[PDB]
Amino acid sequence: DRVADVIESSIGDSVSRALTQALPAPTGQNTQVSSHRLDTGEVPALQAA
């Protein structure tokens, strides 16, 4: 009855897909206890600006 590319079409979506959400933050984040970590595979310090 109606062409498929029109049915499955997404032209018209008025809602903005947001990848992030606003969370409550009434105070500065806390710090948690940390111990030594001697391991391979996990590298928190290495980034890619």
Partner 1 sequence: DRVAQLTIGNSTITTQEAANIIVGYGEWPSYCSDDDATAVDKPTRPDVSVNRFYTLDTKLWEKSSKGWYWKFPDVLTETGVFGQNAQFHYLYRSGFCIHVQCNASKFHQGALLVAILPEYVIGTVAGGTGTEDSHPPYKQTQPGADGFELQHPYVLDAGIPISQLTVCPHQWINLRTNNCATIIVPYMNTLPFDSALNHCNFGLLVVPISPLDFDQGATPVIPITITLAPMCSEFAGLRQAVTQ
Query: Which amino acid would we find at residue 25?
Result: A
Is 39 among the residues that bind a copy of itself (CB under 8 A)? Answer: no
CB of 9 to a copy of itself, least distance (A): 8
Q: Which two tokens stand for residue 45?
A: 């310090």
CB of 10 to a copy of itself, least distance (A): 6
Judged by beta carbon distances under 5 to 8 A according to partner kind, the member of a copy of itself, Na ion, partner 1, none in contact with residue 3 is a copy of itself
What's the CA gap between 31 and 23, in Å, rounded? 18
Residue with tokens 């018209």: 12
Size of the site for partner 1 (CB under 8 A): 24
Q: Which two tokens stand for residue 42?
A: 């996990």
